[PDB]
Ligand binder design. Structure first.
Ligand SMILES: *[B@@]1([O])O[C][C]([C][O])O1
Length: 261
């Protein structure tokens, strides 16, 4: 279609590999570009860790208020929020918020630990019907984004369907779902990514990811004013290990998608 021609052209102009999946919940139509190719998730995986903990809280009703100690040894490479609570505690709710809204890597590692390891995060994905997601490592090594390495990858199509189920569907309880949406809507790291390609009147909840090989990702739920919501996943990775982030590519893909509606 027109939109696939333009996404192909954008990809060609960028020098990298672009993966896009859009789900329009109005008619359950999908637009896919490299939709079944694997991409490194980087920090977009944090949505799955947070949702898994939310699912646990449906039975352990007080789980999110459980304090978790932040020790110096827990600190890894990017801990904007956990750093503020070293030698203190954060609740599982505060860690989930920090992982999602600030992409805090220490928070993510605490969520993985709560789930019994990366296998516990992957297990939740399987439980909600995502056969494609795989989490293999903890922070920060899950961001190595090595070409062809299947570790810590998913496909755009799979992530779009799963994000739809978590935020708009009923993979989570009503309170848990609302909490996840609130967290995503309050993301602080997404201004230059999908959000930048869309009308300012639209409400967006998203989770960015960045990693080696110039990997630049964003997954978003989008609420246009007076219109059915959309789920948009944009994955981008590059051939040079030290390539710079290209958030502009995600903005541009979002703009191209938005134009076609
Ligand atoms: B994710 O990708 O977002 C930021 C951090 C950097 O390691 O991980």
């Amino acid at each position: 279609s027109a939109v696939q021609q333009k996404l192909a052209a954008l990809e060609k102009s960028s020098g990298g590999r672009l993966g896009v999946a859009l789900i329009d919940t109005a008619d359950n139509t999908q637009v896919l570009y490299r939709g079944d190719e694997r991409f490194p998730m980087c920090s977009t995986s944090k949505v799955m860790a947070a949702a898994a903990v939310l699912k646990q809280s449906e039975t352990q009703k007080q789980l999110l208020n459980q304090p978790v100690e932040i020790k110096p040894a827990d600190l890894v490479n990017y801990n904007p929020i956990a750093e503020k609570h070293v030698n203190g505690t954060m609740t599982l709710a505060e860690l989930s918020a920090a992982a999602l809204q600030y992409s805090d890597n220490t928070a993510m590692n605490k969520l993985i630990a709560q789930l019994g390891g990366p296998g516990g995060v992957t297990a939740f994905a399987r439980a909600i019907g995502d056969e494609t997601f795989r989490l293999d490592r903890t922070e920060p090594t899950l961001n190595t984004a090595i070409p062809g390495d299947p570790r810590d990858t998913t496909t755009p199509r799979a992530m779009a369907q799963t994000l739809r189920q978590l935020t708009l569907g009923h993979a989570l309880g009503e309170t848990q779902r609302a909490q996840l949406v609130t967290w995503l809507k309050g993301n602080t790291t997404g201004a230059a990514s999908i959000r930048a390609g869309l009308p300012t009147s639209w409400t967006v909840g998203d989770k960015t990811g960045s990693g080696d090989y110039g990997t630049t990702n964003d997954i978003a739920v989008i609420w246009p004013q007076g219109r059915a919501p959309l789920v948009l996943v944009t994955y981008f990775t590059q051939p040079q290990q030290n390539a710079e982030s290209r958030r502009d590519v995600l903005a541009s893909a979002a703009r191209i998608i938005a134009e076609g509606l």
